[PDB]
Write a protein that binds this ligand. Structure first.
Ligand SMILES: C=C1CC[C@@H](O[C@H]2C[C@@](O)([C@H](C)NC(=O)c3[nH]c(C)c(Cl)c3Cl)[C@H](O)[C@@H](C)O2)[C@@H]2C=C[C@H](C)[C@H](C(=O)C3=C(O)[C@H](C(C)C)N([C@@H]4O[C@@H](C)[C@@H](OC(N)=O)[C@@H](OC(C)=O)[C@H]4OC)C3=O)[C@@H]12
Length: 364
């Protein structure tokens, strides 16, 4: 009954039926809690790997609606049983691929509980039972053995990497990952008050840093932007791009917008402090040498287009504008540092030119 289509072709919805597909089920539920925190409701997400094979995902958000949907069915049943109701395949796909799923909604001092079993078949109605001092939703589900053949066991380190990433992107979000399994009991907490500023320092661990993380945010078009960067004394570039708390591994327009404004502001500043003469412009390449940067954007549903590579042409204009508006003032106020970063980029340009001449001489 709709969920049976998900059960016959799971790959078409979660990619695979291996560790990757198993862990994506966890991410679908985590995302709903993340969305809620974005909207200003809640600040805590608890992920618990249970002894029985299940996984619990709890938040302190508003809690799911308890009432009858536009249709004649309880909203909880609509969410978990109606395909793609509300990647974003929905809680209903998690239910379809679960042996059992339990919902717990904390609303106005009361706990509302609903159970699902086998293909995502309601094994109870929404029952009001228990008193509470908190607001939020808790989803516990045990993956189906027949679906995730030899792949139902949750991996702590896989989840930790993704949960730490979510905490870095949403400052003041506290994520706790708990493993209760015998012989594997562990706990980690991810809470970064300085957000993507803390992400940059993390990516630069084990490398010497040239200055403290430079951060700047703003809004251009309908896109919110967060940019953090810090140079190391090494030569590699490490540009991490994110769209709506989710990584875009192949970059896109938001990444292009950051890179173009960075080259433009650096060149303009270099000529202003007379390091470059009337003498060619520094390439992006020279400027980005040893640069670790995090580009995090928030785009409305209407504007979005592509995933892994953003296509939203307006996001180029958005990042370009925030960087071009904020970076000149950073460089002007950090006079000695910025003069040093200009010289550094000139030396990278000179090194590259000498590599080019040696290559040409070896050819001719
Ligand atoms: C079913 C519901 C009731 C819940 C509501 O979501 C909550 C979610 C919310 O509780 C919050 C984010 N949740 C949590 O905190 C949370 N925490 C945890 C641990 C979990 Cl899990 C959650 Cl959740 C939030 O606080 C409030 C504001 O919204 C949903 C959000 C948006 C819609 C208005 C949606 C709805 O009423 C829909 C419908 O009436 C129809 C269906 C039921 C007839 N529908 C459609 O459902 C299919 C046919 C689609 O199909 C696809 N995509 O293939 C479309 O259909 C189409 C044609 O696009 C989709 O239409 C847009 C809907 O999505 C809503």
């Amino acid at each position: 009954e709709g969920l049976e289509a998900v059960r016959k072709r799971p790959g078409m919805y979660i990619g695979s039926t291996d560790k990757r597909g198993l862990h994506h089920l966890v991410y679908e539920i985590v995302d709903n809690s993340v969305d809620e925190v974005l909207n200003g409701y809640g600040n805590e997400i608890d992920v618990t790997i249970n002894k029985d094979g299940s996984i619990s995902i709890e938040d302190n958000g508003r809690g799911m609606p308890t009432g009858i949907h536009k249709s004649g069915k309880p909203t909880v049943e609509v969410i978990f049983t109606v395909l793609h109701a509300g990647h974003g395949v929905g809680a209903s796909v998690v239910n379809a691929l679960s042996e059992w799923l339990e919902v717990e909604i904390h609303r106005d001092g009361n706990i509302y509980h609903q159970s699902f079993k086998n293909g995502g078949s309601p094994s109870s109605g929404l029952v009001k039972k228990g008193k509470t001092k908190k607001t939020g939703t808790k989803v516990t589900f045990k993956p189906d053995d027949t679906i995730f053949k030899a792949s139902t066991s949750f991996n702590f380190d896989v989840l930790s990497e993704r949960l730490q990433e979510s905490a870095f992107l949403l400052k003041n979000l506290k994520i706790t990952l708990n493993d209760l399994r015998s012989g594997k009991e562990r706990q980690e907490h991810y809470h970064y008050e300085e957000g993507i500023k803390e992400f940059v320092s993390y990516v630069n661990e084990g490398k010497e840093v040239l200055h403290d993380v430079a951060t700047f945010s703003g809004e251009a078009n309908g896109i919110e932007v967060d940019v953090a960067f810090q140079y190391n004394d090494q030569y590699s570039e490490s540009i991490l791009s994110f769209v709506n708390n989710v990584r875009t591994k192949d970059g896109g327009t938001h990444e292009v917008g950051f890179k173009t404004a960075m080259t433009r502001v650096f060149n303009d500043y270099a000529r202003r402090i007379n390091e470059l003469k009337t003498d060619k412009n520094l390439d992006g390449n020279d400027i980005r040498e040893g640069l670790t940067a995090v580009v995090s954007v928030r785009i409305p549903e209407e504007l979005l287009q592509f995933k892994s590579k953003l296509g939203t042409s307006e996001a180029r204009s958005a990042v370009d504008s925030v960087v071009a508006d904020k970076l000149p003032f950073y460089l002007e106020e950090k006079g000695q540092l910025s003069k040093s970063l200009v010289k550094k980029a000139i030396k990278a340009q000179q090194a590259r030119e000498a590599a080019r001449k040696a290559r040409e001489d070896a050819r001719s």
